[PDB]
Write a protein that binds this DNA or RNA. Structure first.
Ligand SMILES: [Zn+2]
Ligand SMILES: [Zn+2]
Ligand SMILES: [Zn+2]
Length: 92
DNA sequence: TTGGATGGGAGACCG
DNA sequence: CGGTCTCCCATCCAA
């Protein structure tokens, strides 16, 4: 219930989830608390789990299978699967 | 045009 | 109340 409020008071932004507030604060601070560390791919995520879905790309865990016979295309994320599904089927 | 890939965000799961 | 996870968009990104 205790939404954590954005340091820059006037902004009036508030979120109980720390990750959310980090992602918010990143806009002002430029901070990215969840780095990937990996050489070259030294990415800076502002929230946990977004890092984990990114990790699907390192692990190669392509799995979000379009539920369409024959067109059983496997995508990296549910949203990518949805975009495809929309783009190719749910065009309406 | 397309699916791979990232910042941002409501909601689900767990405690 | 709050981290990890579930689920997703919009956008960026390389093909
Ligand atoms: Zn703010
Ligand atoms: Zn990485
Ligand atoms: Zn399809």
């Amino acid at each position: 219930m205790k939404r954590y409020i954005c340091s820059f008071a006037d902004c009036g932004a508030a979120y109980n989830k720390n990750w959310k507030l980090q992602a918010h604060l990143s806009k002002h601070t430029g901070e990215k608390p969840f780095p990937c560390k990996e050489e070259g791919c030294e990415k800076g995520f502002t929230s946990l789990h977004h890092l984990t879905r990114h990790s699907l790309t390192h692990t190669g865990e392509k799995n979000f299978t379009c539920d369409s016979d024959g067109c059983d295309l496997r995508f990296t994320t549910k949203a990518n699967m949805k975009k495809h599904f929309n783009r190719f089927h749910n065009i309406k």
